Design a protein around this ligand. Structure first.
Ligand code: FAD
Length: 501
């Protein structure tokens, strides 16, 4: 342990942006990540497990693998008992909500679908009226786009390849309902994907990999921002180090208690690490838990009442349509979405939907969708001193507005095509809409609420939040581009106004 000028907690999008710009500014920075650096070939020779061969690497400290949501009827047959291990995907279970997050150097960038989408400007202006939207769209969205290595599918290759038949089927069905589709930019390299389909490079997206990591193709943050941060010479990353408490001492700045564990979860050491500037990039769940705990255990007692508040799941809802026999979606489905349905107009009926692949590897006739909706309901994280956890108080009825909007859109598609929903994909009770999961947790430490308009935590100096906990519950699109661009904005201002090299 010891002192380092800047500490960044976590290594997801907010953290990675912050560490790069700190290091470029000459500020010696230590990143603390609770998960692994994913660079050691495993027993199959690969870093990551695929969706048809899950093992302990798939899961953060669970004793059994799980099928990706939507796929249980086909993928339960590959599930196995596993040792609890520091694997890459954590399903965090709350009372009535399961939030999925990445664990490792790169955070959710390791496990996500790569979809890189800028929000609608008029919606950005609605959710964050205190922010100057011209500087976001003129400067920080472009900077994020370039640094993340966003790229665009070859639309002619898209049209021709078997691997996107599933997307084409939903496009034609939507089209009968008078709905067009949009191509979705991605950080998975689409040139690599063409080499995969040609047999020239190892398959990853085209071998049912994404949610437990991609062994190839996906430009996760370890390849982009974090590689650049290490390249500054001013940034180091310590792994299997979980920050537990944050306090003030006579040294000035902040002092952390940090548990070092092995990959089996055994406690090896508790370290004291301290800093002048402290940046929280532990995600919506992790940053909020740290600050709720610090407030309610009295280590940072002047934190305000908005710490913990304002959480939402980005309106996330999953649903599925049963195609007729003559409209198969194909046995070969790229694991990386390329198409969406943009029915988002900022009204309460708004939906932005991903046309999601089914990883079964054989024909199912299912079209799967992940809808993003506009639902004003919010939850709060409440400290439980008995277990030393933040607990999210969300109830399943709070997703009714999200379900309603999703269903109105997909009812229009079903009606135009003579199809019905599947009701059997999400457990044994009949349920067409999965309404108790989240891939896109947003809020808990909302920008301008718990913090100033640049993520400076209210009540404290040189204490910053950088990540999805800043966003007010919803962005109307897949969120990592927004998180990245906001982080670019915030750290540039913080370095200029607050920091010394
Ligand atoms: C299955 C899935 C699919 C998704 N698909 C998309 C997509 O296609 N496009 C999109 O835009 N978004 C997608 N997302 C969401 C996106 O990945 C997240 O919005 C984004 O990763 C959030 O970034 P963040 O910086 O807030 O936190 P995270 O990326 O979650 O990173 C937080 C990091 O902090 C670490 N950490 C947490 N607590 C501590 C602690 N106390 N001490 C040390 N380290 C800690 C974590 O282990 C993690 O590495 C998806 C996510 C999932 C799970």
């Amino acid at each position: 342990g010891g002192y380092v000028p800047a500490v960044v907690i976590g290594t997801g999008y907010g953290a990675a942006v912050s560490a790069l710009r700190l290091g470029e500014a000459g500020v010696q920075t230590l990143m603390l990540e609770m998960g692994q650096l994913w660079n050691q070939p495993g027993p199959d020779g690969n870093i990551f497990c695929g969706m048809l061969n899950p093992d302990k690497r798939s899961s953060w400290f669970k004793n059994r693998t799980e099928a990706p949501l939507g796929s249980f009827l086909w993928l339960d047959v590959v599930n196995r008992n596993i040792d609890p291990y520091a694997g890459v995907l954590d399903r965090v279970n709350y009372d009535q909500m399961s939030v999925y997050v990445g664990r490792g150097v790169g955070g959710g960038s390791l496990v996500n679908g790569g979809m890189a989408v800028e929000p609608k400007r008029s919606y950005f202006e609605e959710i964050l009226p205190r922010v100057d939207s011209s500087e976001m769209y003129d400067r920080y969205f472009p900077r994020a786009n370039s640094m993340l290595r966003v790229n665009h599918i070859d639309t002619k290759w898209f049209e021709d390849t078997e691997w996107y038949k599933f997307a084409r089927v939903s496009r034609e069905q939507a089209g009968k309902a008078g709905l067009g589709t949009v191509f979705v930019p991605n950080v998975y390299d689409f040139g690599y994907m063409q080499r995969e389909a040609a047999g020239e490079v190892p398959k990853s997206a085209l071998a049912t990999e994404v949610i437990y990591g991609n062994n190839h193709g996906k430009q996760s943050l370890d390849k982009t921002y974090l590689a650049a941060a290490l390249g500054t010479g001013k940034v180091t990353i310590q792994t299997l180090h979980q920050v537990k408490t944050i306090r003030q001492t006579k040294d000035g700045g902040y002092a952390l208690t940090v548990e070092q564990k092995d990959t089996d979860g055994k406690l090896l050491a508790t370290k004291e690490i301290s800093c002048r500037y402290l940046f929280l990039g532990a995600g919506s769940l992790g940053s909020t838990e740290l600050l709720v705990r610090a407030r309610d255990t009295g280590t940072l007692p002047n934190l305000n009442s908005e710490v913990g508040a304002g959480w939402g799941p980005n309106g996330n809802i999953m649903t599925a349509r049963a195609n007729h026999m003559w409209n198969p979606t194909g046995a070969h489905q790229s694991s990386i979405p390329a198409l969406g349905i943009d029915a988002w107009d900022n009204s309460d009926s708004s939906v932005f939907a991903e046309i999601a692949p089914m990883p079964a590897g054989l024909e199912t006739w299912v079209s799967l969708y992940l809808a993003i909706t506009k639902n004003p309901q919010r939850g709060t994280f409440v400290y439980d001193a008995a277990t030393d956890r933040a607990k999210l108080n969300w109830t399943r009825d709070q997703n009714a507005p999200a379900v309603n909007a999703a269903k109105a859109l997909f009812d229009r598609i079903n009606k135009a095509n003579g199809t019905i929903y599947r009701y059997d994909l999400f457990g044994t009770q009949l349920k067409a809409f999965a309404d108790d999961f989240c891939y896109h947790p947003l809020g808990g430490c909302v920008l301008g609420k718990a913090t100033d308009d640049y993520g400076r935590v209210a009540g404290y100096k040189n204490l910053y939040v950088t990540d999805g906990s800043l966003i007010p519950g919803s962005v109307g699109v897949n969120p990592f581009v927004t998180i990245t661009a906001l982080a670019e904005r915030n750290v540039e201002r913080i370095i200029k106004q607050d920091v010394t090299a």
